[PDB]
Amino acid sequence: SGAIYVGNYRVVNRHLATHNDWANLVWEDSSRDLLVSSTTAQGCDTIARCDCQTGVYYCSSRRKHYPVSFSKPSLIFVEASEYYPARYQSHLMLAVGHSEPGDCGGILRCQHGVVGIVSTGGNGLVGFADVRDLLWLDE
Ligand SMILES: CSc1ccccc1C(=O)N1CCC[C@H](C(N)=O)C1
Ligand SMILES: [Zn+2]
């Protein structure tokens, strides 16, 4: 679990969004596994606006933050799960690292701020849904 809180927006994995997130929907994209809902109070996370490919992510299944190198956002095949059929997920970045399904939502950060959240894994990898192209999160 986990979210990004920037301005009056809450960014979560779409597959973990609540019925209340859908009522307060701003934007969602199944192909990116992202959902943004509106909030009453202002959030304090800063979104990174950069092309960093190294950062640190939070792994709840280890209670540990790990430094990682990660690929640029791409269209990657993701195996079927209880949340989606087998499909390509877009704006996805992969790294070598530990992840379990409950780790989705953990933040990936660089020196500029929040880059994205954990969204995929399997086979000794961890994948992150990029949010750096969502410029409207800032206004
Ligand atoms: C850290 S997610 C994970 C972890 C271990 C094994 C598999 C996964 C994983 O790739 N999944 C499961 C949850 C939904 C994901 C999605 N965004 O389609 C796909
Ligand atoms: Zn950066």
19/7 same-domain check: yes
Q: Buried (b) or exposed (e) across 44-76, using 16+ Cβ within 10 A?
A: ebebbeeeeeebebbbbeeeeebebebeebeeb
95/33 same-domain check: no
59/22 same-domain check: no
Type of residue numbered 62: R
Under a CB-based contact definition with an 8 Å cutoff, are residues 29 and 132 in contact?
Answer: no
How many domains are there within the chain? 2
* Binding-site entries for Zn(2+): 50, 52, 110, 112
3-state secondary structure string, 35-100? Answer: EEEEEEEEEECCECCCCCCEEEEEECCCCEEEEEECCCCEEEEECCCCCCCCEEEEEEEEEECCCC
> Which of 118, 5, 134 shows the shortest CA–CA distance to 62?
118
Instruction: Tell me the C-alpha distance between 134 and 41, whole Å.
Output: 20
What is the number of the ligand 1 atom nearest to the C-alpha of 81? 12
64 alpha carbon – ligand 1 mean position (Å): 19
104/129 same-domain check: yes
Domain that holds residue 20: 3-44
60/98 same-domain check: yes
Instruction: Tell me the C-alpha distance between 83 and 16, whole Å.
Output: 9
Instruction: Tell me the C-alpha distance between 73 and 129, whole Å.
Output: 8
Under a CB-based contact definition with an 8 Å cutoff, are residues 92 and 34 in contact?
Answer: no
63/25 same-domain check: no
Structural method: X-ray
* Sheet containing 4-13, strands listed edge to edge, beginning at the edge strand earlier in sequence: 4-13, 34-44, 25-29
114 alpha carbon – ligand 2 mean position (Å): 8
Q: Is 104 a catalytic residue?
A: yes
Q: Is 15 a catalytic residue?
A: yes
68/97 same-domain check: yes
119 lines ligand 1 (CB under 6 A): yes
